[PDB]
């Protein structure tokens, strides 16, 4: 017993007799194994984790001798609490190492000896993979046993005669076992089985131990909560179960979701508990995060969980058709009156105050109602495709302001706001049944190819104009070092539609360049058109689902939801107010 390497060598091979003759002498030299000179200097690890990693098929019989040495030394906390001093690891004491090794044969013994069961492992190696780490488990020993599928360890640790572990205690991100176990979950089958079963187990255990507050309500620093994290991260596997949890045990049934209320024999009327799938715009809502958020990995199936898919339909029926049709008619009529204010727009000058006759009085009435509509729906936008209307209304209000002073020719961008509003109407109102995918084709095309054209266009123009200037311009257009943009106009006019100036009657260049520009225009148009419309379409089903979902959600967001236009309320007390949404299924069992 002189240096760490020999200790590691002896513990690796499971030899204890060779160490008895020297450990006694070291204990006689008032030395303690917790000293840094007895710990590996790179990370400060003690020989305990090394020996544990040297498990002889889980049958390392030397570590009891190490516990005996610890007891003899008289120091237990520092020896047992022997974190790693490097940044690659944090904490990772005997409990962490033992649990990682799936060794129940010695974790129980070392905890009975008395060991810290709440060591916080806030390590770089203990942080989410996508963030930069390798394995994330919630930075708790019990959470580490839970994540790694060790039900026996969790049971013993929470029921050990000595210090137990409280499931409520959270970590750096305020996760707790539930958050961690949502994090490690996937959408597979083998993973989603132990995760869901053991997660219900932890919740139900916390319930029996403490029925005051179900563990699910403990929110991380992000203020998400396990269901919300499962939804956001894209965990269909655990989300599909967290909503239909109805643990039958009456003493702890109250923390259920798929409340079952009645059935007429062929029809079962389930009473799903959406206590947190819509906060009535009060706090974060699962539906909002599910639909608006675009980072969600797989919203294709999550919306089809069941209570959500039917809550959307309920909102549609209650306040989704009325308000939407009122809105579309209001907007369309607003834009039509905008157009018929344009066609009548103040004539013969006199912009500021032309209203001096009956027809002009009607024109002013149209203009003022349109301004009021613009400012009102801009108020709606601010209180909350939203950028499109934002620019729309700022432009319209600016134009009206310029009109107030009657500044000549300053009512220019008013018409641009008109066209913006019209294309906006073409954009938003996609809820009029399915018609291919107009808006989605817009975005997939929108301006992408257009600027590619513009750029190749401009380069060709400059290239052949340079040919001319090295040839004639010091030809067709008077060859006097003239402007080039007129070359663009000519190219658009004739090589696009017709009536060219011949321009040679030079040629080696022009012929090749023009055939090339035609070839490029062809390929771009055809390739874009075919590839976009044909393959990537995915026209209606989930695209349109998300479309009317967004329409319904932002409809509710628009006006005050808390008014008498919300979803149902349910059972009063002694069983759950705990509003609920009832879905009627039919089965032939």
Ligand X SMILES: CN1CCN(c2nc3c(F)cccc3c(=O)n2-c2ccc(Oc3ccc(F)cc3)cc2)CC1
Q: Taking CB under 8 A as the criterion, which residues in 498-557 touch a second copy?
A: 508-509, 512, 542, 545-546, 548-557
Q: Flag whether 150 is marked binding.
A: yes
User: Can residue 343 be called a binding residue for a second copy (CB under 8 A)?
Assistant: yes
Q: Flag whether 89 is marked binding.
A: yes
Q: Is 209 or 509 the residue whose CB approaches a second copy more closely?
A: 509
Closest contact distance (angstroms) between CB of 326 and ligand X is 5
Closest contact distance (angstroms) between CB of 307 and a second copy is 6
Which string of b and e fits 11-34 if b means at least 16 CB within 10 Å?
Answer: beeeeeeebeeebeebbeeeebbb
**Contact region for a second copy (CB under 8 A) — 170-178, 223-231, 306-314, 495-503?**
306-314
Q: Flag whether 106 is marked binding.
A: no
Q: Of 6, 407, 412, 485, which one interacts with a second copy (CB under 8 A)?
A: 412
User: Can residue 334 be called a binding residue for a second copy (CB under 8 A)?
Assistant: no
Q: Flag whether 477 is marked binding.
A: no
Closest contact distance (angstroms) between CB of 553 and ligand X is 9
Contact 169, 180 (CB under 8 A): no
Q: Would you put residue 350 in left (φ > 0), alpha (ψ -120 to 50) or beta?
A: left
Q: Which residues contact 315 (CB under 8 A, 6 or more apart)?
A: 552, 555, 556, 567
Contact 234, 193 (CB under 8 A): no
57 binds, among a second copy, ligand X, none (CB under 5 to 8 A by kind): none
User: Can residue 184 be called a binding residue for a second copy (CB under 8 A)?
Assistant: yes
Closest contact distance (angstroms) between CB of 388 and ligand X is 6
Q: Flag whether 45 is marked binding.
A: yes
575 binds, among ligand X, a second copy, none (CB under 5 to 8 A by kind): a second copy
331 binds, among a second copy, ligand X, none (CB under 5 to 8 A by kind): ligand X
Place of tokens 């058709």: 321
User: Can residue 90 be called a binding residue for a second copy (CB under 8 A)?
Assistant: no
Task: Report DSSP state, residue 462.
Answer: H
User: Using CB under 8 A as the criterion, what x/- string covers residues 131-170 for binding a second copy?
Assistant: ---xx-----------xxx---------------------
- Tokens coding 464: 């052949």
428 binds, among a second copy, ligand X, none (CB under 5 to 8 A by kind): ligand X
Closest contact distance (angstroms) between CB of 338 and ligand X is 14
Q: Which residues contact 589 (CB under 8 A, 6 or more apart)?
A: none
Q: Of 323, 429, 482, 532, which one interacts with a second copy (CB under 8 A)?
A: 323
- Tokens coding 78: 């520092």
Q: Taking CB under 8 A as the criterion, which residues in 461-500 touch a second copy?
A: 462-467, 469-471, 473-474, 481, 484
Bridge partners (DSSP) listed for residue 584: 269
**Residue number with the smallest Cβ distance to ligand X:** 428
Q: Is 199 or 338 the residue whose CB approaches ligand X more closely?
A: 338
Bridge partners (DSSP) listed for residue 585: 268
Q: Flag whether 568 is marked binding.
A: no
Give residues in contact with ligand X (CB under 6 A). Answer: 323, 326-327, 331, 380-381, 384-386, 388-389, 424, 428, 554-555, 558-559
26 binds, among ligand X, a second copy, none (CB under 5 to 8 A by kind): none
State the Cα–Cα distance between residues 442 and 181, nearest whole angstrom: 41
User: Can residue 124 be called a binding residue for a second copy (CB under 8 A)?
Assistant: no
55 binds, among ligand X, a second copy, none (CB under 5 to 8 A by kind): none
User: Can residue 74 be called a binding residue for a second copy (CB under 8 A)?
Assistant: no
585 binds, among a second copy, ligand X, none (CB under 5 to 8 A by kind): a second copy
Q: Which residues contact 550 (CB under 8 A, 6 or more apart)?
A: 291, 292
Q: Which residues contact 116 (CB under 8 A, 6 or more apart)?
A: 77, 80, 81, 93, 95
Q: Flag whether 152 is marked binding.
A: yes
Q: Is 234 or 431 the residue whose CB approaches ligand X more closely?
A: 431
78 binds, among a second copy, ligand X, none (CB under 5 to 8 A by kind): none
Backbone angles phi, psi at 586, to 5 degrees: -130, 130
State the Cα–Cα distance between residues 464 and 474, nearest whole angstrom: 15
Q: Flag whether 129 is marked binding.
A: no
Q: Flag whether 299 is marked binding.
A: no
User: Can residue 311 be called a binding residue for a second copy (CB under 8 A)?
Assistant: yes
State the Cα–Cα distance between residues 46 and 39, nearest whole angstrom: 5
Q: Flag whether 197 is marked binding.
A: yes
Residues of the chain with a following break (C to N over 2.5 Å)? 384, 474, 505, 576
Q: Is 148 or 323 the residue whose CB approaches ligand X more closely?
A: 323
Chain centre distance of CA 360: 53
Contact 352, 404 (CB under 8 A): yes
User: Can residue 565 be called a binding residue for a second copy (CB under 8 A)?
Assistant: yes
**Contact region for a second copy (CB under 8 A) — 67-75, 171-179, 368-376, 573-581?**
573-581
**Contact region for a second copy (CB under 8 A) — 61-69, 159-167, 171-179, 309-317?**
309-317
Strand order, beta sheet including 267-270 = 260-263, 267-270, 583-586
* DSSP for 33-102, written as a single string: TTSGGGS-TTT---HHHHHHHT-STT---SHHHHHHHHHHHT--HHHHS----SSS-----HHHHHHHTT
What is the distance in angstroms between the CA of the first residue and the CA of the last residue of the chain? 72
Q: Is 25 or 262 the residue whose CB approaches a second copy more closely?
A: 262
Q: Is 146 or 420 the residue whose CB approaches a second copy more closely?
A: 146
Q: Flag whether 499 is marked binding.
A: yes
Q: Flag whether 383 is marked binding.
A: no
Measured from the Cβ of residue 568, the count of other Cβ atoms closer than 10 Å reads: 11
Measured from the Cβ of residue 473, the count of other Cβ atoms closer than 10 Å reads: 17
Q: Is 26 or 487 the residue whose CB approaches a second copy more closely?
A: 487
State the Cα–Cα distance between residues 441 and 529, nearest whole angstrom: 10
User: Can residue 119 be called a binding residue for a second copy (CB under 8 A)?
Assistant: no
Known binding-site residue numbers: 45, 50, 54, 89-92, 101-104, 149-152, 197, 499
Known binding-site residue numbers for ATP: 45, 50, 54, 89-92, 101
């Amino acid at each position: 017993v002189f240096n760490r390497p020999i200790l590691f060598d002896i513990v690796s091979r499971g030899s204890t007799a060779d160490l008895d003759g020297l450990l006694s002498f070291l204990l006689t030299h008032k030395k303690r194994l917790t000293d840094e000179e007895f710990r590996e200097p790179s990370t400060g690890k003690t020989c305990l984790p090394k020996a544990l990693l040297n498990l002889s098929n889980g049958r390392n019989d030397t570590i009891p001798v190490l516990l005996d040495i610890a007891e003899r030394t008289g120091n237990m906390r520092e020896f047992i609490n022997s974190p790693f001093r490097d940044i690659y690891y944090r904490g990772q004491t005997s409990l962490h190492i033992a649990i990682e090794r799936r060794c129940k044969h010695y974790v129980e013994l070392l905890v009975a000896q008395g060991a810290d069961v709440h060591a916080q492992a806030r390590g770089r190696f203990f942080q989410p993979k996508d963030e930069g780490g390798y394995f994330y488990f919630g930075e708790l020993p019990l959470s580490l046993a839970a994540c790694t599928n060790q039900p026996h360890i969790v049971n013993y640790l929470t029921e050990n005669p000595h210090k137990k572990a409280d499931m409520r205690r959270q970590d750096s991100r305020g996760n707790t076992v539930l958050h961690a176990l949502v994090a490690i979950a996937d959408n597979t089958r083998e993973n989603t089985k132990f995760v869901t079963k053991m997660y219900d187990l932890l919740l139900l255990k916390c319930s029996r131990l403490f029925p005051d507050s179900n563990l699910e309500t403990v929110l991380n620093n992000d203020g998400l909560s396990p269901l919300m994290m499962a939804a956001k991260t894209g965990k269909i596997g655990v989300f599909q179960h967290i909503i239909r949890r109805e643990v039958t045990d009456e003493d702890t049934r109250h923390l259920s979701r798929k409340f079952k209320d009645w059935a007429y024999g062929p029809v079962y009327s389930s009473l799903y508990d959406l206590s947190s799938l819509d906060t009535c715009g009060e706090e974060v809502s699962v539906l909002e995060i599910l639909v608006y958020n675009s980072k969600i990995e797989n919203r294709h199936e999550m919306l089809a969980v069941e209570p959500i898919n039917e809550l959307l339909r309920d909102k549609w029926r209650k306040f989704g058709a009325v308000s939407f049709y009122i809105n579309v008619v209001s907007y369309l009529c607003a834009m039509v009156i905008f157009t018929l204010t344009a066609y009548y727009q103040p004539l013969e000058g006199t912009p500021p105050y032309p209203y001096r006759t009956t027809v002009d009085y009607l024109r002013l009435a149209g203009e003022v109602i349109t301004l009021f509509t613009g400012v009102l729906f801009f108020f709606t936008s601010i209180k909350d495709f939203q950028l499109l209307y934002f620019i729309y209304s700022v432009l319209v209000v600016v134009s009206a302001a310029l009109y107030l002073a009657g500044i000549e020719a300053y009512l220019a961008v008013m018409v641009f706001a008109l066209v913006l509003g019209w294309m906006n109407a073409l954009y938003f109102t996609r809820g009029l049944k399915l018609t291919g995918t107009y808006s989605i084709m817009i975005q997939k095309i929108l301006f992408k190819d257009l600027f590619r054209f513009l750029l190749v266009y401009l380069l060709f123009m400059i290239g052949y104009a340079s040919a001319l200037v090295t040839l004639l311009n010091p030809p067709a257009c008077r060859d006097s070092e003239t402007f080039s943009a007129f070359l663009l106009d000519l190219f658009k006019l004739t090589i696009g539609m017709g009536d060219l100036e011949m321009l040679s009657s030079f040629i080696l260049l022009l012929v090749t360049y023009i055939i090339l520009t035609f070839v490029l225009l062809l390929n771009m148009l055809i390739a874009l058109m075919g590839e976009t419309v044909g393959q990537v379409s995915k026209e209606s089903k989930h695209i349109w689902k998300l479309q009317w979902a967004t329409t319904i959600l932002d409809i509710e967001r628009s006006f005050p939801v808390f008014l008498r236009k919300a979803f149902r309320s349910g059972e009063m007390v002694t069983v759950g107010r705990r509003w609920c949404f009832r879905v009627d299924e039919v089965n032939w069992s």
